[PDB]
Amino acid sequence: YEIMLIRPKTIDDINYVVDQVLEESNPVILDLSFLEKESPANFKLAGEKIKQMRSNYGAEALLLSRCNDKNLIIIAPKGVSLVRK
Amino acid sequence: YEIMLIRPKTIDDINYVVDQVLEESNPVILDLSFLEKESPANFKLAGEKIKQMRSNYGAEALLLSRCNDKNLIIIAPKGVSLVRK
């Protein structure tokens, strides 16, 4: 497979992540810092999409890093396990 | 596959990462902050192992985050593409 890397800025980027996780079954490493400070409405929307993916499709989501200008999340689809070691 | 998550502390943990990338073909998300401040010798060793993996085995390595107490790297084996979007 592939691991996609993105810093979402628009609703189209949020739909891009939904499609990689659910249609392509590709993990996505995404930085939510732009949405967080530019569009609080799209940041809430992005989070709702991640909640639905985990609740209904078995996706795992992990926070990797959280500092000024960075909010790194990894979303793995059902089929790719995030294994803590 | 699986994506392994580790904060290496010993040489055995460094050999663990070599084996996941090269034998299991699993990507590894690793935090090199412990080695960096506790064993500069093992931090250099860890970096040499990553250079050899990329040079001879086609592994990709990406820096995801670098702050106080964190140095997050992702190592993808030949077969898993890290795709910037």
Partner: peptide, 10 residues
């Protein structure tokens, strides 16, 4: 602004 959509932290 919590990340209340995660299953854990690295």
């Amino acid at each position: 602004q919590l990340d209340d959509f995660i299953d854990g932290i690295f």
